[PDB]
Design a protein around this ligand. Structure first.
Ligand SMILES: *[C@@H]1O[C@H](CO)[C@@H](O[C@@H]2O[C@H](CO)[C@@H](O)[C@H](O)[C@H]2NC(C)=O)[C@H](O)[C@H]1NC(C)=O
Ligand SMILES: *[C@@H]1O[C@H](CO)[C@@H](O)[C@H](O)[C@H]1NC(C)=O
Ligand SMILES: *[C@@H]1O[C@H](CO)[C@@H](O)[C@H](O)[C@H]1NC(C)=O
Ligand SMILES: *[C@@H]1O[C@H](CO)[C@@H](O)[C@H](O)[C@H]1NC(C)=O
Lengths: 442, 169
């Protein structure tokens, strides 16, 4: 035999094959990736009726899949045809695949007709469709999607999609997606003066989404506001807007606006439980900016350019448990910054430039379990700063230039010694390099 | 002894993957900077005649963004080797992934500096000398270039994933 056959698995990778090889009838897993198969047809898999898992990824460019190629593979659950450059599908290529659950077609130069034509009509049990990195410019699923009742995962990452509107996504109405990944599709036409805004309606009408990934799409504030107004009411549990590269003003520039209280108003009825706005050049957290996220439990703003947090920035976040502000440009913390966060359990302030903590910085945070202040520029803290943090389980204070002069260091050294089971890593004195916990002031 | 050879080809394949991932990460940063530049350029083009004072603030930001592109181009490294400054781009990176000598994989990555991408000369205060459409086109060509380089690396990564599965079998 040409391939390596172990039990139920035929591994046929990179064997210089020009056709499907001869294999034991009992194999149910076949990997034919990295071969030179130019054409597949109904004879190709006619001796392998028991296949459950089939890969034919990244052949020489131009693979042709004829009608009924997989007809009679009525046990096939997973089919992967990724990285077939200039893949040529006949419209009945997937005939017979009523039980297929996963189809992957990443980077196959496919266009929007692959969703609007009859290619996927036979796939009545389909659960997951991966179409990343193709040439899909509009997302317009054909009417048969209405009856694909287990369909719940779609990934269109890296397609250059001009715009999405209610009329495009019609045939996804009524679905519950567990994952809708529309990352880095750009949506270039949907700008400030586009007439499509008046008629766009709600792209996600009567659709619910557990995880909506809209990362890497720009989302200039004015665009975000329009987009979230358009989808108002859509139930979304987890919203990913990381790498929204137009959203923030940026540190030292005012060409663009940071989000404000009106930006996310459309999300008020969405029930969002987690939100990721990391890596989006945000400079200022403005008054009530997050107050429409009435159900929010986790929020990351990591890796922005945040240097300014307005009073009442977190107003209305009465359910928030976790707040990540790691890797920003904060120069200090004061007690007003973190008002309106009574339920907070996890506060990450690591990798900032913080050089001072205001006297009662954490007074409004009695439920805090985890507090990261590592990798900042703290030389000292005010006496008693951590005393009311009665639920604290972990604290990071390392990689800070602690001034271990006495009596300045008295409180912190005594506190870190008394609470040595909470400290993660080891806070060290500038100069001497000894652990802060070991300093005894007389 | 044949087992050692498979173990070696596999480790070298994983390392190719980590290298490619580092480059993909940096390229997605470049891409994001370029799209922000595009958006700033669009906003500049839509700036009224009475609002011409805004153009200098836009140029200031784009100039800093062009600097960031160059910072990425110059610092991005794996295993002590620069990935995106073009300095390795004629030889490329070669991985020994075959269970015998000859079976080999070479990856070329072009320079992604602002000069190599042709976005160095952008100037939103000077649509009178270098047309808005030409400046926008420069930015779109640079976006296409970065995106094509990323796609190319995705194909090679996929090849390396399959080679690892192959060696394991
Ligand atoms: C806050 O977000 C940061 C940035 O995303 C998270 O940083 C990651 O941290 C993990 C574990 O420490 C590392 O393995 C990753 O490499 C980090 N990613 C980056 C991009 O730096 C951090 O974990 C988050 N904090 C909390 C408490 O979730
Ligand atoms: C598939 O192609 C071969 C030629 O390679 C042809 O003879 C065969 O009839 C085709 N199969 C079917 C089911 O038509
Ligand atoms: C493939 O199948 C479609 C629909 O099932 C059919 O209309 C067509 O005749 C077939 N195409 C070719 C080129 O034979
Ligand atoms: C949404 O879809 C469900 C499932 O088809 C349907 O029964 C319901 O009537 C729809 N609701 C609206 C408001 O269109």
């Amino acid at each position: 035999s040409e391939c390596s056959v172990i039990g139920y698995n035929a591994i046929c990778i990179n064997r210089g094959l020009h056709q499907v090889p001869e294999l034991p009838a009992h194999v149910n897993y076949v990997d034919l990736s990295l071969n030179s198969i130019a054409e597949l047809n109904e004879t190709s898999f006619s001796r392998l009726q028991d296949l459950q898992f089939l890969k034919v990824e990244q052949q020489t460019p131009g693979l042709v899949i004829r009608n009924n190629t997989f007809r009679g593979l009525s046990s096939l659950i997973i089919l992967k045809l990724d990285y077939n450059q200039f893949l040529q599908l006949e419209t009945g290529a997937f005939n017979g695949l009523a039980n297929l659950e996963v189809l992957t077609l990443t980077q196959c130069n496919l266009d929007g007709a692959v969703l609007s034509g009859n290619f996927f009509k036979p796939l009545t049990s389909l659960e997951m469709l991966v179409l990343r990195d193709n040439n899909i410019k509009k997302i317009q699923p054909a009417s048969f999607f209405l009856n694909m009742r287990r369909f719940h995962v779609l990934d269109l990452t890296f397609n250059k999609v001009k715009s999405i509107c209610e009329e495009d996504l019609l045939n996804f109405q009524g679905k519950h997606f567990t994952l809708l990944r529309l990352s880095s599709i750009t949506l270039q036409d949907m700008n400030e003066y586009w007439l499509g805004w008046e008629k766009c309606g709600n792209p996600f009408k009567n659709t619910s989404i557990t995880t909506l990934d809209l990362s890497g799409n720009g989302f200039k504030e004015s665009m975000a506001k329009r987009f979230f107004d358009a989808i108002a009411g859509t139930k979304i549990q987890s919203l990913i807007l990381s790498n929204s590269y137009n959203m923030g003003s940026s540190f030292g520039h005012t060409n663009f606006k940071d989000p404000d209280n009106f930006t996310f108003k459309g999300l008020e009825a969405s029930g969002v439980k987690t939100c990721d706005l990391s890596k989006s050049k945000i400079f200022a957290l403005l008054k009530s900016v997050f107050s429409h996220f009435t159900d929010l439990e986790q929020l990351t703003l990591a890796q922005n350019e945040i240097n300014k947090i307005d009073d009442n920035a977190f107003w209305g976040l009465t359910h928030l448990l976790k707040l990540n502000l790691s890797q920003n440009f904060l120069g200090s913390i004061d007690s007003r910054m973190f008002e309106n966060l009574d339920k907070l359990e996890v506060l990450d302030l690591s990798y900032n430039h913080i050089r001072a903590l205001g006297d009662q910085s954490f007074l409004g945070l009695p439920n805090l379990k985890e507090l990261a202040l590592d990798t900042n520029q703290l030389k000292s803290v005010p006496d008693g700063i951590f005393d009311r943090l009665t639920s604290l389980q972990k604290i990071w204070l390392h990689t800070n230039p602690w001034d271990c002069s006495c009596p300045r260091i008295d409180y912190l050294s005594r506190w870190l010694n008394k609470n040595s089971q909470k400290e993660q890593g080891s806070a060290k004195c500038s100069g001497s390099g000894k652990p802060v916990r070991s300093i005894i002031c007389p | 002894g044949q087992i050692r050879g498979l173990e070696m080809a596999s480790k070298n394949s994983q390392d190719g993957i980590s290298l490619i991932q580092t480059a993909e990460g940096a390229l997605t940063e470049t891409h994001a900077i370029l799209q922000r530049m595009r958006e700033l350029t669009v906003q500049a083009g839509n700036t009224g005649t009475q609002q011409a004072e805004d153009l200098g603030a836009i140029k200031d930001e784009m100039d800093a963004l062009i600097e960031e592109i160059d910072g990425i181009s110059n610092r991005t490294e794996f295993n002590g080797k620069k990935l995106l400054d073009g300095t390795n781009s004629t030889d490329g990176f070669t991985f020994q992934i075959g269970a015998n000598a000859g079976q080999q994989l070479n990856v070329k990555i072009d320079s992604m500096s602002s000069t190599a991408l042709g976005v160095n000369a952008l100037d939103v205060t000077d649509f009178a000398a270098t047309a808005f459409d030409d400046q926008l086109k420069s930015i779109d060509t640079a976006i296409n270039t970065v995106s094509t380089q990323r796609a190319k690396l995705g194909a090679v990564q996929n090849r390396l994933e399959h080679t690892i599965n192959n060696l394991g079998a």
